[model samples]
Target: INDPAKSAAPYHDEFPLFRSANMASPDKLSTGIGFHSFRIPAVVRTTTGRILAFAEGRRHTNQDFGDINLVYKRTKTTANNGASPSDWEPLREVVGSGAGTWGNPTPVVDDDNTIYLFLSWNGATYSQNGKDVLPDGTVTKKIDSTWEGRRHLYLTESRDDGNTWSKPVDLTKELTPDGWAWDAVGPGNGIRLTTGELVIPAMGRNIIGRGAPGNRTWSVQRLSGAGAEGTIVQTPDGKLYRNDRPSQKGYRMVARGTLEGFGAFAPDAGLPDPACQGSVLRYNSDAPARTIFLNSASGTSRRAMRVRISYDADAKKFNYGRKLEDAKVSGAGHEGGHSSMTKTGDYKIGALVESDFFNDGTGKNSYRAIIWRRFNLSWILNGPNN
Candidate 1:
């Protein structure tokens, strides 16, 4: 974690950008307020030079049946709100999806102050926006039954800052799987490439043998004036698996990285006073081509937690990665981490984390929000890296 913005290491401060609630279930999973989250802090500049940061949120755990939904917050100063006596304000934009969870809410602003939120809506956020084109020359036409409860990216436009939001709309039509049994985890923010074309990123499992083993790969949906272009990406193994995404602007366009291993783990070293068990790092940096995703490996309990990755932006190529946390509180459920990012000043990354400890006998998995300011990096894990 190196950067010119702060004198210390890019991630030198104590971890858990934010953690909430002290609720957990029996089997070591978290619940209650929902813990472990991350996002690339989003900032929006006003005509008067005001920098406003915002983020999206969620709460979940593997051992427990944690309910899920989307929420947000804002920060004027750079700090960890998850710590007690925090300084973040809530921005309840939207929530709910009928029966499933609604997480990963990324905030983007057009030339105007029109803020756009792209999220997943299992409750039918798809097919709601009609059809659209992706960057790879493909047409994101509409949603089918198969896409009903699976993770799908939905869009919500905001006229004001982040005070109020618009109805949910589908950005990319449902992606027809390769018939290998799909893994719809979630997608990241859309980056308006230097060429104006949009690229949205999403991750899924490539189940080579449906019932056999599977691998993880981050997929990017390329779109343009015409329609869906294709996909561009680098798998966890550092191999380039493309999707016909028209790279009109240049450089390989798609970059991938995976967790290396747990850097250093002890105990509640960087978290708030009364810590939780499952705090995770949400959001990752991708642009400048120097992208980095940070997470914890969950100690001996979860197997000596550490950070891992497919590519190392600092190394200029694919390599193993480790945790960025100063001490405790590692990454969250690989399936979910900081789900929101916005560009108010530099780049605000929003991460969600568990609020209670694994031993905390609570019913919910309690989660909190985190806002990381991105100055040298761009793009988050769930979406594009432009």
Candidate 2:
């Protein structure tokens, strides 16, 4: 059941601006939350027979100028699973009808079936094509700071079975530490580890999100109540870099506290780069909170995207890891960001994949939407033979 193949779209999407191909170039759909108003893209059934999905919606579409809507699709386990649309329905519209485009919906269900969704939002939309140069000043597109909307982070809750959601709340509302700008929480997920602690993985781009250049793209942790607002990595802040997408723990025992690489991850996430794709997931054969990351290693050349295998361990943070698969090719190709990694029972992972060219039969257009697959975690703990 451990497969990372999400969907089977050819490789087509439509962006208002100009890119390369079309389709959901960067698959940004979420499971646990519903899709098309039905079918949880990713989910972890609860003991109470409750199938809660962390429903999230659009904050920004490729249109550049868009609106921010937080709508969540929900369904009870009692509902029959079918391929027809009638089989399921849009359970709720958390937040919509706004002037901003709140893209990417990531939700995680707690042990109590409580769901929480963390997404990137723009209270005020700022249209900056990653430029700072104005009429003068070398007449370049790169600038110290360009034009854009007032962007920040937001979180919403659905205590009532993903049905009625709360008004989107700002996680970092007034707690402006220092330098906080723009960031994107589009490519992240959450986990309720064995300790009953909910761990949510998110990326903060400095040059645009929080810190400065050297402080850009740093990953932090927000402890539930311990006031563990966030913690950075041993790596000193430098020019520009971003380390994001983390799972609790995996089989290989990732030998580092902070685990991540660039290409797909950058300090200024506002800028787009279709070449990056990765995830941190946990597949514990006997546990519920094992974290493992499925990432994009050497994905610069072709539309082909690679999956790197890493795990979270005690040594402080994400430690040892291995290339479980390699640039084995998913489909035509793939762009980073629009992907998800989740637990599929029995310490295994179910990865929602998107490819630019359908590498390993996954399909290129997989990006047009979100794809789902399984990851056999035990294999990592006991070699591929497990």
lDDT of each: 0.33, 0.36
lDDT of 2 by residue, 1-386 (tens): 23332232212111111011233332233433222111112343333433333323323222222443454333334333211223334334666646554544556565555566665655333433433222123222211122234445666666666656778776554322334454445344554434334444443321112222112222343222111111112222111112343322111111122222322321222111233434444444232223354443332322322333322232123322333342233332343333455543233344544423332243211222333343453333433322
Error (Å) of candidate 2 at residue 74 is 4.3
Instruction: Please write out the lDDT profile of model 1 over residues 1-386, one tens digit for every residue.
Output: 43332232233222333333332221111233443432322333333323334333433432111234555544434333222224444334355445244554444344455555556554422322334332233333244446453345566665655556667766435433432222222233333323223233433321110111111122333222111221222332333232211113211222232222112211222211111112112223443233333322332222222232233422233223333332334432212222222222334423332222334233223333342323222122211211
Show where candidate 2 strays beyond 4 Å: 1-65, 71-92, 128-148, 174-179, 204-277, 285-291, 301-337, 345-348, 355-367, 375-386
Root-mean-square deviation of every model: 14.7, 12.0
Residue 81's C-alpha lDDT in candidate 1? 27
